[PDB]
Subunit: 503 residues, 4 copies
């Protein structure tokens, strides 16, 4: 009898006209002759060996083994081979390292984000460890002494799987993740020896972490006698293991059982005298880790848009295979209209994301003006919250486009919704990032810089005037309308970027 | 140190001012003196023994046991005690039966839907079998002879758990659920024995079913020699087991592993000569199930709005317990604005749902005018698609309101999203129901009756002309705008109902 | 086609002629008119509601939940309803309490062991907590002050499920279970308050425990400044929880994943300042807990023989249902011979066990002579190691009697082997108990008392002379032959007991 | 504090003096210079990469996937990478193929069985598919025409993992495995297409199989019109899949959930018109498989003895690491005596196994005398039942030697018992093989040849007359004593072999 043909993917570089148009606009000729063959290669991996490895990892979530059979506390995390293979891919394909090889100026970061864009949707969210890894590298690059950099950066930026390290960012505690002022981890002076010049020992509990699959982490802690709240916090570097391969006074409580990102180990950890090294000076921890957030927020946006592209690729292919009421779905005007609406949102998201990625590249190579640095600071929280909300909306619509099959896990479709929902939570909720945006307006004339940019780049008169109205509201009402303001700006910049890239 | 206090529920009758206002409007005094004490009692169960049973059922999904240890095909489905307990609650509390005791005229159905509204969110979606059970009761009431009614209705409408039956509705096949014209199940004339006057034996595969724990089912099949497509389909009644308790030539292929509704068994079944009894004549099947669909689509809506209420109850309670940046969440203007927006959608949904529930009650007791019957027919698909989309949107926002905790399954919060996503899929997707709406407009000039209703009851000026603008469009452009039309109408009717009930 | 009829059980009092003959010999008329109706009742439960509950418990092993969803350490152990129900049965049926109601003199213990014999094989090894409970009661009865006894004994000996307590015996540490001299748990003086007059706080790790399902435990610990090795150990009483239902500075590391006894929670625990009360004086812990071992060893023997009876009941029933080569298995001479051999071993085991149970009863009611107390001390380790080895041999033969089906878990047959294998491990291995036997010979002229008993009761001349030879060997050779000696004596006493009971 | 050192293995060629002595006796110089380096290499793999792969396979049992996500029946079996790796090892190391390279005459089979002896205990029972693969190769060698041999033997005997095939032997049905006369699978004449010259289509159910990962199988079926019982059964060859990789009308009902051999897929299968090719004539099936059974029963024996060796290697190592009562276990006379007893049984088993392996080699290269061929036929069932019972006894004692740890699965010790218990069940129970032995005695006066062999080679005086006493008993009393006869003979031959090999 009848069996429905399921959705199939095709090379995700060649299938993505929007990505190609953007790169033709943002990459100079010399970058293109390196980057484009690499991207076509990665696009093939994304739908072949990576796709298989990601499915394996999703199907075999990590398992915590606290004790060996004779009672020794080992806190092992067992992972799938697929998960380990995707880590090796991240190293050898230079998914992080490409940004730090600045041959192509601002285009180095654009090239790297393009690699991430293809890699992430077939990575079972290994792209999240990559974001934290990239962030840690930059933080060390900016603030760490020469000896610490010489030790760690060759690992984080390695193209060699056998020497590649990932980093964790352990910022969230039970008191809060949005607000870290309640951080209860203490840092006592330490005078023992260590391989990285530890200065303190850490004591506390970290409530969401990427567990023990990372070799290093950055974290916040409060030194003996330091002030209460955020001002008392310093940034610390630590390595998870010693020479032995033994955990450095770190205990794993358990893995979280999550809605999605199931292949990613997310653990609750206790630091029990973990040796650590302060990065920067006392009380500057929050500000120091602040200057990395443009990276992690932009990784999140690019991953969210890659996720959107994956969901739509599956939906588009199915729409040309499933018939109802005598027609293929793609030929039903209402279905086609729905598809078109989602694709239009996709084009906004990818243009907005790469516009901002290019600004990040400019800043990293020292080409950004003072005002441009402020503009980047304003746009990244907006980009993040905008692409994340769109990714959830689009994923939910795609689940429904598959009908009953979309609700059944072995089709691979429910994962689209479960994983998308993370994008609007980690690294800031919609509302927290909307307030970060509003806050930014208050300082360094950020509001005016944003307005000059929108006027110069010919944002719509209607949206310009509506923005001016919203920004004249009371403090209280601007907070109440902070989402509206963020999405107004996001849509305006997305349209500007689309025109710029001829999308 | 610090541990966050998690969300807590309270009696869901006493906590719901909107439900109480609606019932003060819709229930006459005599109905109130029976119904309100019953609802307060049920509201207490919803947050005590039912809540525990539902958690147990979610935690222990059903398991298929195809073979006994000696190779006999038994196709057992093992379920939790909690699941069985929630079934007993449905019977003893009259979650279905209350509607069929038409003591209170049209208010009997309103009283029943209020019971469902409190029951469903603490039922681990046992309310879905109840919808199909109610639908089957009505179909038999309208179309079955006295002997079949006397046999079956005392079971479906039982208040005695020991004699209560549920029904399945087996309409979807691999070829389609939206479009059932492709139904490939054959019905051969049958003269063997059965307890219910079987006329045919059925041969085919049913692709989504509530499996084999229901005692009876309604289904569609094509009798020998019948026309192709929908015109060849007849409605059939069948009982799943014989007196020995053996399945009547039904095999379970497997249970679906689903995104959500995990406590609910959803099975793929093969009918292998299952005896069945034709209800009505050849080619009348699709038309006969039309009045089963009105009931299930209103059940779906009431269940979706009860789900919204549960999500918001959890969010509201947490918002008074969780601190960030120096304030409880409920005291942050943006957080409060977000909550207010969700509550506003809730009030639209609950008013719209009970407005339609009242129309259903009017029709069932023979008190509905021609226009009211037409209004009921056009509004039911709109109500279903409207409440389903709102429930998904609100659930996703509530998951995000809990931050990282919202993404971790043991908090009970991710279930809100996973379960909500089913509401826009079963019983019709948004687009399929929007087209059903448009088709309904075209017949008996139903479209005109709706518009006079909207004009008479003083719908909003702008949205009305925008709505009127859309209904004058060409056929295909009208299809492209079918969603917008549905949501405009839904919002207009919700506003009318809220005013009517003083919400 | 063909389906094999599987094995079925029948009332295990009425089906057991050997048990009935023994009780007709050991129970006086007044005891019989109470005990026999009770046993017939329990025999019916063993094959009805208990059997179902035990299967549920085996099918749903206990699960450790260390943390609540908000990070509080709760160390819950989730168990099946069946497991909880079997606990209630133990209380209401007086499976422990009957022995301590000494109306019937020495026959009270015999009556109780008969209850255990029927209960244990349908208890999913809840009989193990009962053994430790009985033991704890006796220890408190002998050595605890009046106030501690008045508090605890009404719980341990309760017939009321709502007030019934079980006890754990936490003797094994990582250094050893056979040899407890390496015990590393410290007992520091304690001056805080507690509900049971705690005198110390305990600090250490207990490597095999019955987890948190018990309300109290007995354990060994070394007080501040005490001698090394066994002589430095004292016996302690502790309660697992306080008023709150909170664990008293007890942390659960994990549950063991075991070969069998899967329904029984077996945990690794850390005592982290657990309040405890010393029982008896400093350094007498090993000797004090020594005087209970006759109880736990006899429980183990009775449970092992009940296990044998269950395996043989299943095998006998199957042998009358399965045909091969034209005959039922029971009519194949070699199969029948194999069955007869196993049954002969059963009759030895049950006679030996109840002979020893009767000696225990005599001692507990003060009717035992000095020599009889010594005889009991010699016979209990022999009984334990003998019945345990036989239970494993018989279970393995029964698995094989079922052919391929015996190797498949859903038949319930592999459990027979997996569970039996525990009998020869807990409470002493074959070799450790054989050496305990040899040790006993050395003191209080135990060897001669044993010989006088065997001669008086007309043991076989051949076995008598062989025993005399073995006992004249060197110290080294007697140890090498300790198993042979134990089984020679066990078989001799079993034959004596069988003749005495007309088996 | 203290953590117990667990057991460790070492190269299992170098650690095995008995194996080396046997091979110095059985392998001529030219065979030794090839075989000994190969065996030392394999002995290293057994405790390194194979050990890890076997642990992985045990930890991740196979999973049946009956349907793809769109409802297609695929009956996939998902296996671990470790399982697949152990299959590749079997090919590349020539664990089967070495026997068929008869370079070394009868010593080729001895060399091969030595490879199997080292491979099997670290193979997670992949050695069972190898036994059936070897059996199938021999059957085709004897009975298949040139074209079928040319097609299939290069696969079964391949050293290239990419072309290696395994075979199933599907003999057992629900009616019986010991007695196959009840076989109900029909064979209808067939003229459709196939790659191997199929003659019939098979219809029936196979109750224990190694499932669908093997490429071919041998099986019994009753052609249309054939006689009832064994006289109607013919031997059939079939290939499981077509060129597309689709199963050839074979459905998997389920995988068995077993006591042990958990890595091995054991499935219940239905043949639904499976094309097959008759090998030989009608009614010759049972006779034709007789020479497949000799090979598999010797494989079983060698695997059982390799299992014994693994258990004892673990026990021996632990005995030098675990202290109790002031001494390492190995220095306690009773513990040492117990170990010595087990090792003595091991030496009997390994000598007996290779003695028979040599006879098999002699017969396969045409060098065996009439008496040797008869000796091989009578000894093979005895060897199988003898080694199987010893392996279970020794495994149980080894589990107990580890104390509580022996009962906990993560130590790897309980597997020893669970897996050993299969050896006395598959390929014939103790009693069925004992009767096979007796039947063999009765034909061609084989019984007499054995006894002269025993007398000639100077069997023990007492046991011989006791054995001679038993063989003169009446038919039925001889049946009742069939086990005793088998074990007397086994012990006598083991003593003869040990002397012959200087063990």
């Amino acid at each position: 009898n009848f069996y429905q043909d399921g959705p199939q993917l095709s090379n995700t570089f060649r299938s993505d006209e929007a990505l190609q148009k953007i790169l033709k606009s943002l990459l100079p000729a010399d970058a293109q002759k390196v980057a484009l063959p690499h991207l076509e290669h990665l696009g093939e991996r994304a739908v072949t060996d990576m796709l298989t490895w990601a499915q394996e990892a999703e199907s075999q979530p990590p398992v915590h083994v606290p004790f060996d059979p004779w009672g020794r506390r080992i806190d092992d995390i067992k992972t799938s081979h697929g998960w380990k293979a995707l880590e090796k891919v991240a190293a050898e394909e230079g998914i992080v390292a490409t940004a730090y090889d600045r041959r192509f100026g601002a285009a180095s970061r654009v090239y790297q984000m393009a690699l991430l864009y293809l890699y992430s949707p077939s990575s079972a969210i290994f792209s999240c460890p990559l974001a934290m890894t990239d962030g840690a590298a930059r933080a060390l690059e900016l603030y760490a002494d020469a000896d610490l950099k010489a030790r760690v950066l060759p690992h984080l930026l390695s193209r060699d799987p056998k020497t590649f390290w990932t980093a964790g960012q352990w910022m969230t505690e039970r008191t809060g993740g949005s607000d870290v002022s309640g951080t209860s981890t203490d840092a006592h002076p330490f005078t023992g020896t260590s391989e990285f010049g530890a200065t303190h020992s850490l004591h506390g509990t970290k409530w969401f972490t990427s567990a023990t699959t990372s070799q290093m982490a950055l974290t916040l802690a409060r030194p003996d006698g330091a002030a209460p709240g955020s001002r008392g916090l310093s940034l610390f570097f630590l390595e998870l293991r010693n020479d032995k391969g033994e955990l450095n006074h770190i205990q794993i409580h358990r893995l979280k059982d999550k809605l999605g990102t199931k292949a990613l180990p997310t653990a609750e950890l206790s630091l029990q005298g973990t040796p650590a090294r302060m990065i920067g000076g006392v009380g500057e921890g929050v500000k120091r880790i602040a200057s990395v957030l443009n990276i992690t927020r932009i990784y999140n946006s690019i991953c969210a848009v890659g996720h959107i592209r994956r969901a739509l690729d599956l939906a588009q292919d199915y729409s040309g295979k499933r018939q109802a009421f005598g027609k293929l779905l793609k030929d039903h005007p209402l279905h086609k209209s729905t598809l078109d609406s989602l694709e239009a949102d996709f084009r906004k998201c990818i243009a907005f994301s790469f516009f901002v990625a290019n600004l990040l590249g400019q800043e990293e190579v020292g080409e950004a003006s003072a005002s441009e640095k402020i503009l980047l600071r304003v746009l990244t929280p907006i980009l993040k919250l905008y692409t994340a909300k769109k990714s959830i909306h689009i994923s939910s619509e795609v689940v429904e486009m598959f009908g009953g099959a979309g609700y059944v896990e072995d089709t691979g479709i429910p994962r689209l919704l479960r994983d998308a929902q993370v994008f609007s939570i980690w690294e800031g909720t919609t509302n927290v990032l909307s307030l970060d945006m509003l806050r930014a307006f208050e300082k360094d004339q950020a509001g005016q810089i944003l307005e000059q940019f929108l006027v110069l780049n010919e944002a719509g008169s209607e949206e310009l005037v509506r923005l001016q109205k919203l920004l004249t509201l009371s403090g209280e009402q601007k907070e109440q309308h902070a989402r509206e303001i963020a999405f107004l700006i996001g849509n305006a910049v997305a349209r500007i970027a689309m025109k710029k890239y001829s999308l």
